[PDB]
């Protein structure tokens, strides 16, 4: 019954995803695929009965039984190389890197929009945490500009994240516009090595009309936070959304600032690494629907 899945990239995101997908109703993770025989994710795959290989995508594509789905959590450049190979082999790809070969998917906002695509992009951790908030504002009032700041514990960002910081920026900004509904988007990512490790923070700033109904915006935000929290229970509002009066420098627009904290469930890294969960729970939602196609 279950769709046969491969995970390419047995790192922080890939290993968290492996755990979450083994709770899945419709997906069997059959293959874990990396490039370093010492990768902890390959060891976790083996302990869980999943076929594991450090022989890369070459090895995956040689297998007698090809997966129905591939989730890639390597780095943007690696996905750019692998995406056409998946397309040729007829394997539907869910891209957890910011490569953005496929259209941008934020499940709380546009889950069903791109289900027919051969490759879907899940944006970034920052995006998955904040684009639902951008949408919660823009569905109430026009948002001329929206900016997100994602701060992550350094221990939770592996080499694959660190190698694609530029792409993180640009893909998240593009998604703020195309999926979040803001006319212009900006994204910032900060790595903090503090001990004890920081729980992921995300701030969302939206330019809003000076005459906006701020009670309506707050209600919309709260509703959206509850919808996200159904899938990531540690996704919370830190404070009431903060509204600020118009300024000349803001072209006469007012602002709303929304402060989120994202605790994870501790599947692989501890709960402070909610950045993993906000992405992997999103990828799992997309995967569960893709798995049910004929």
């Amino acid at each position: 019954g279950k769709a046969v899945a491969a995970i390419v990239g047995p790192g922080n995101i890939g290993t968290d995803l492996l755990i979450k997908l083994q709770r899945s109703e419709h997906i069997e993770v059959r293959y874990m695929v990396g490039v370093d025989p010492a990768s902890e994710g390959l060891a976790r795959a083996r302990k869980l009965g999943v076929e594991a290989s450090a022989e890369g995508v070459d090895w995956l594509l040689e297998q007698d039984e090809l997966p129905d789905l591939v989730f890639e959590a390597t780095s943007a450049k690696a996905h750019l190389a692998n995406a056409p190979r998946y397309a040729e082999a007829g394997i539907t790809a869910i891209d957890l890197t910011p490569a953005a070969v496929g259209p941008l998917v934020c499940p709380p906002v546009n889950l069903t929009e791109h289900l027919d695509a051969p490759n879907v992009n899940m944006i970034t951790c920052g995006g998955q945490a904040t684009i639902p908030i951008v949408h919660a504002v823009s569905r109430v009032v026009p948002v001329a500009y929206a900016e997100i700041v994602a701060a992550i514990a350094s221990r939770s960002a592996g080499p694959g994240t660190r190698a694609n910081i530029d792409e993180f920026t640009e893909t998240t900004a593009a998604a703020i516009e195309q999926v979040g509904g803001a006319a212009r988007g900006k994204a910032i990512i900060i790595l903090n090595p503090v001990e004890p490790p920081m729980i992921m923070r995300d701030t969302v700033y939206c330019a809003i009309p000076p005459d906006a109904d701020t009670d309506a915006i707050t209600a919309s935000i709260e509703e959206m936070v509850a919808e996200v929290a159904r899938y990531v229970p540690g996704y919370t509002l830190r404070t009431e959304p903060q509204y600020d009066q118009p300024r000349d420098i803001w072209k006469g627009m007012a602002r709303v600032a929304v402060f989120l904290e994202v605790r994870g469930n501790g599947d692989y890294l501890p709960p402070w690494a909610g950045n993993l969960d906000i992405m992997t729970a999103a990828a799992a939602r997309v995967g569960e629907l893709l798995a049910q196609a004929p």
Partner: protein, 337 residues
Amino acid sequence: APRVRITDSTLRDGSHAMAHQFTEEQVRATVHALDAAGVEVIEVSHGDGLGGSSFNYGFSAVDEIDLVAAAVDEAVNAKIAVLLLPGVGTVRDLKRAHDAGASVARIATHCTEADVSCQHFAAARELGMETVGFLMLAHRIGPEELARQARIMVDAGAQCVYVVDSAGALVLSDVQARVQALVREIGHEAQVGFHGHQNLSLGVANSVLAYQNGARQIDGALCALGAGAGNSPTEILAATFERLNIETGVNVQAALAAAEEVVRPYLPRLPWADRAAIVQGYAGVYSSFLLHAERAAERYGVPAHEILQRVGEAGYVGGQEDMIIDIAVQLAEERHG
């Protein structure tokens, strides 16, 4: 005695103190005065580097690329430098600054995160720019750990790596130890720099000690214009190195006139080690948080130095200005009781 190269950051670090409201005329006048004084490198960007204009850090009054272009047009001998922070600025931003005529790329990471700088160093070297690496909040880790991060930057393409006292929290021997370690690690193939803030009034001394332990690049700003209590003042660095018989190429009288006659008239207020700035130095808080803390203090009716003390306890890094608002909201409730 080997010469030291001063980079002036009046128009980049100073952008923090100006709330990024620099006009083209101010940039042109300041570049002209610096260049005429013999200053060899003049940094021009948003406070938080290219792409810094934002709600989080404050919007620029004038596009920083236009200011970079005006700086390049104005300079006769000086190189124009830009700062970028990976995670804020992009390679696309760097390319725009290069097109505008910037010739030195200063790439800044938190001191423990040098490996995020690889994309930007590669792009800068391909463009033929001089490269400088900035290890921010350098008090947060020890000398040998900092040298390991310096090596990562050199391997990525940095031609100099700075010890950056972003919080103005380093004290004398602290600088000696860090500069010594970087010199041991990278000195045979790259320069070592120092960038000091004035939060404990040690920027200039720390800069002298840096040079005496092998640093060949040192940052200042005219009138100390910069984040927190300000930067080591360019005009004092010029005077002090001259007294020490260390060549800088900077005319002291001309530097004193640049500070007094060009920069001082447009200062919003004098860079000052008041209680809030000293709390930054003591607690190790990123200097650019200061005006944002003062804004939140007024917005929420809580003291700025109490915001900054809490920020100190939390260990935030450069770029985390948003956390100031969360803390100020909490303090308003706690103080109400």
